[PDB]
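Consortium newsletter contribution from the modelling node. Members have asked for a concrete example of what our holo predictions look like. Here is one, prepared for the magnesium ion complex that several groups have been discussing at recent meetings.
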Amino acid sequence: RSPLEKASVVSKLFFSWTRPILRKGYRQRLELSDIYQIPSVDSADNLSEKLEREWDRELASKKNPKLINALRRCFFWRFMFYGIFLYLGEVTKAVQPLLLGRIIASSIAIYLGIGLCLLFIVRTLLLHPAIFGLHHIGMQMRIAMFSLIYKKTLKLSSRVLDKISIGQLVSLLSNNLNKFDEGLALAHFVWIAPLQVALLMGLIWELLQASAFCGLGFLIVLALFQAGLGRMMMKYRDQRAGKISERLVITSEMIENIQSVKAYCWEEAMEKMIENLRQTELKLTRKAAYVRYFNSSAFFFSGFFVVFLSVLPYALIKGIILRKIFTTISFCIVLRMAVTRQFPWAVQTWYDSLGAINKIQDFLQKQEYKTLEYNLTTTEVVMENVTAFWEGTPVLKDINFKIERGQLLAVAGSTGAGKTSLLMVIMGELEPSEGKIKHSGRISFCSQFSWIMPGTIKENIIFGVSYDEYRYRSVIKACQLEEDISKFAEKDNIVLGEGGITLSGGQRARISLARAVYKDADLYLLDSPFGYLDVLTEKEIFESCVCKLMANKTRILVTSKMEHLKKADKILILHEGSSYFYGTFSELQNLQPDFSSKLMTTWNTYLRYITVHKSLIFVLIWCLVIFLAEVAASLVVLWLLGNTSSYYVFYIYVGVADTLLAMGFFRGLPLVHTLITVSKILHHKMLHSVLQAPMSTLNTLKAGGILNRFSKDIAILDDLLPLTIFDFIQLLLIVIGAIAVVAVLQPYIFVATVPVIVAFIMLRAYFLQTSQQLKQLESEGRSPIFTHLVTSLKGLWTLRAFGRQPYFETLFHKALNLHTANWFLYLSTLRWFQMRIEMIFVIFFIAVTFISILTGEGRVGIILTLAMNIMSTLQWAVNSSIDVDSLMRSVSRVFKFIDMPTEGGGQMTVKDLTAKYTEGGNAILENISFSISPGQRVGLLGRTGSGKSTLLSAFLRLLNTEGEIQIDGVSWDSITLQQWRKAFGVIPQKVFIFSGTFRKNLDPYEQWSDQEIWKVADEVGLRSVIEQFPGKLDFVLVDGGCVLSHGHKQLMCLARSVLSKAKILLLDEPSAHLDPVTYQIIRRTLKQAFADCTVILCEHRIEAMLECQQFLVIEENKVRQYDSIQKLLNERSL
Amino acid sequence: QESVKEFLAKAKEDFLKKWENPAQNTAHLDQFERIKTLGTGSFGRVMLVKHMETGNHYAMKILDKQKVVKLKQIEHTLNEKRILQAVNFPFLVKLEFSFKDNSNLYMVMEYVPGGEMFSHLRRIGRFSEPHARFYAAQIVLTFEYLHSLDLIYRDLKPENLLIDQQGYIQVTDFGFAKRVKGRTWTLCGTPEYLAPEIILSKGYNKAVDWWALGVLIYEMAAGYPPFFADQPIQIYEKIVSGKVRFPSHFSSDLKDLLRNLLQVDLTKRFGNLKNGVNDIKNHKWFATTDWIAIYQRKVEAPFIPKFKGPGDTSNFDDYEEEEGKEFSEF
Ligand SMILES: Nc1ncnc2c1ncn2[C@@H]1O[C@H](COP(=O)(O)OP(=O)(O)NP(=O)(O)O)[C@@H](O)[C@H]1O
Ligand SMILES: [Mg+2]
Ligand SMILES: [Mg+2]
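And here is the predicted structure:
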């Protein structure tokens, strides 16, 4: 199926089979169906069975279960086969400069140039085809490990299942989701680097004989310096993490409570608090970035020292021919590449891989759930003196029962305090230490909190079984599912989404009942099934399925209804962990009659990004100016000298382009500092904008869709982006300077370099489209794995009790294959692009080398010296450019966020009121008109329970509403919303208290005197409540003010409203959240202090609002009116 | 070792003499009864009878002379008679007397009142792991003894295993047993347990029965044949594929043991590389087993079928009743 299986050897070597996808995608949008079929070797089942067989052979062979010892005999030979070619492809690069050192002899030189070309041609084909194979091997290990971990996730016992955290598994799984696959190209350098440096040191000894350790020791100490700076960076990052946490919690708090801040008009307050929190964050980030810049610039600077120190001692004693400089420079840069970056990367990769493998090994040895010796045959299910602990505390007090084949017992008592534990013990989920519970083994459970697997209702009720027409029809009709099906969208195959949110609680109960009744079993332990249905619905279900069909076979229901126990063939009442009463129906009913009665990437995004700060353009033009000045100086000195030992020594400066074009410490720092300031400015502006968006627009944005732009985009903008763009600019600057230097020294190079740049741009633009499309497809193809994992972790109990694990295993394998197709295809196309870029560099090198040799001693030496070693910097620059293009999406999204437009006497009058949730939805009010009496309460009656929050929100103009409002003789248009909203006071159902001291939590503006605040608090009756707080008022209300009670929070909100001296108090749900003592105290306080406010109490109960003078009736699309109870109770409510 | 090797050598020496002097026509069809037909079988019939002179019940086999010639099955029964007259082990049905008549041939064998183990497996569905191990130990022991006798069973399916009063397995139906020294060639048996070597129509080695044991273990521990298909031709393709899908409730040790007993590679097949049976007998899945007690029947059986007297036929199925140069040594 996959085109890899049908491909020529040349195509497999040149990656020619990836052409058609690039051909199609660049011109049209990809469809997910266009992804190639996975190779049959990469199927999840094929790798899972192999690794599982090796792992269980390891388990049954020795008493030292090393998982790596099982991975070895699987993958070691292919690993080594690819490593050998990697070693050869590194050795050819290391030994190439020996040919250059002989080329400088000038006839014979043409053959040497051809040989120099041959080495590059061979290296182009000996490196990438092995790197791709290593990546393939990594993908295989990742797939097999994921499949094994999932296959073991359905075997743990509940004894260890509940102990682990939910997030542990997802953190472990996602920790190495991409690290393992790309963490193999650097794996072999744990033994290629030492042999490389040994060969190189020997060869340079064969040219110096006196000075070899001098440069190697310098490289070593530089390497330890670079490694040691990492701990300094890590300490600052760890310090910054907690501060990011404490800032993000407050940001999330205000994101959740946006409407409360909008009503209170607290935007500038939180602006100030957020900036104050972020200042120290910026300080720490700047320090860490400075450390990172120093570490990065050290490698770029050391390129000159590492050769100067090596050359100096031999230079002083003997004179040196120019050959032994142009050769040692190349050997030295190769050694620096080989010992400064590759080896520590390999060590880090090995350490991380070993850690992850040991973690997986530890996980695969947890306590395992054991299936009961079941499915054979059994008489009446009998339990004799079963005693076990729900965790020492025996949840079962030597219970005993025996239900004949067909009888329907009914356990009763407190929920989950012995009924659920007994049901789990019977199901075998909990092992009983004492007693022997015998059962037929076919048990179909139905948990109180039913779980609905993603898919159609038919899929959630079939459970991988046939759709028997009579059985399914009877199940639908009896369990009240026939009417639901008739009301369903497709009415037979309504494809529900994940989570079951589209279904109601009664729908979930019906689904659970259908699932329980579908399976034919000798025991149907339907536990608390009727706990979410109507009384008439419960009676219909009992007369239809529970006591009509499910009573034919053995069934043990658990209900607290008195009528339900009447039809039971046996009764076992348990309470406080002990069986208070047990026996037959009549025997237990007459055992105690008294007790029985008691029981019952565009250029626009770029230029906008730079133009946010004028200092950025200044520093960039400064850096460019110093660059062109220094390249001009180097070019003029080269021309002067090429057309006393120090005269020849100065060539070492121009020979290594790294140091000659290195970004000075006086130039790199302003760039990073300005980028950090730009990120701060952008974050502040986006926070300012998001706090003024219209509510209707905010409703279109999901709550979780805004916090991510704060928690992830800002971190990317601060940490990853600055270093990435700095590295890209430095690398591009080095490349352009070096190529200009080469071109000037020989003016015929330019005609060859121009097509090279043209082809570079063309190829990059061609590859970018497919790369980004595949990246997005892979990213969107990864959610189902975690969604299914969470769903299975929630449904584990029902899944195991039913006994349908292979269905879930096959589903997970299908999802894994679906993601693997995208990942493998993207990896292949990336390797194709890398190889093509290597080939174009190779042909450019051919051209420059031949034109140089065909046409002095310094000329050719310098040209070839830069020519051979530009390649690493060029490849690095291209990769950095692709990475910055990948990172630009965060800036694009933040800029999408920033450009969001803003929203725009006691007697009051309202008219022509029209409101809706969105722009053009259902009219909440249809020209509703009312007049506000001065200081007289107007109860909110009429359409109680139909939803009055919309009217309350529109009273403050916090929704998509239009009309005319005349409060105190002033229209709603002339008065500014900031000024108008302050006059009106509201009492939301949920009280928002800022996480901080009482003075800050109650006075965010802090514009009131402390003595006045204390006097107001004493007058509000909260002085006694505040007296129990730590200190006097500095007790920080951490965790969103969870210390205070709901009544205390309501009292604090009322006191805050009184402090603002609002002209109105639209109290809503007074007694709904208040305790009887709290409600009485609140009512007394409102009567005493808030008597002069035109309050409007909102409550569903008519009696609660009957105390108000006026009674503003409500009705669908028409606000009725009955100012007197003499007609309100007779017409409005009757 | 030591005692086991000496016992095997003594058994081989004794069996050589028995194979040297087989008997014939030890009884006539005049001292038996026709109480019930225990079962027909492949192409014959078996009826439960009692000794007229003694009173002890003995099973009697019946085979049609015309059917043997028509089916080209003459040497197999001749060799099976000698094998039964020469085999001597606790786990094999003991034959008492043989009869030869001008109409049909008869032979007297000891009766096991426990019935077929296939019915028990089908009614119960599947066994627990220790229960399956208890039978696997006996099967491995009798296969050890039979291989030490330079013979091949080649036909091991559940309905050919019986249970006695003490609860141990007695192995019957030696009709397909052949004493082969070297590579065999004859194709026969049951499609379910047809080993990959026999399916390819090649010289079967002594490891052909190892695949039968590895399939019987899976069938006893799961409840369905590990290799199943609609048609024998399709079943042949499935067996040639050699891919097995283990259930979820299988333990790791059994998952390891079954893989070696069912590997397609003849060289790496368990019980054939170097040890013969010593690898299997020392495996972790068999660690908790008293083989010395198993040989002496000193361990209580985890299952005792309900015996209701010598004449009881409750466990056995009830289905109606019944009313020259080729053979010269019967
Ligand atoms: N010694 C015995 N005691 C009790 N039942 C027996 C005995 N020998 C046979 N039977 C039963 O009689 C039935 C038929 O006899 P059997 O030995 O199986 O002939 P068969 O044709 O060669 N068997 P097969 O080829 O596998 O189909 C068997 O299914 C046994 O259950
Ligand atoms: Mg038969
Ligand atoms: Mg038989």
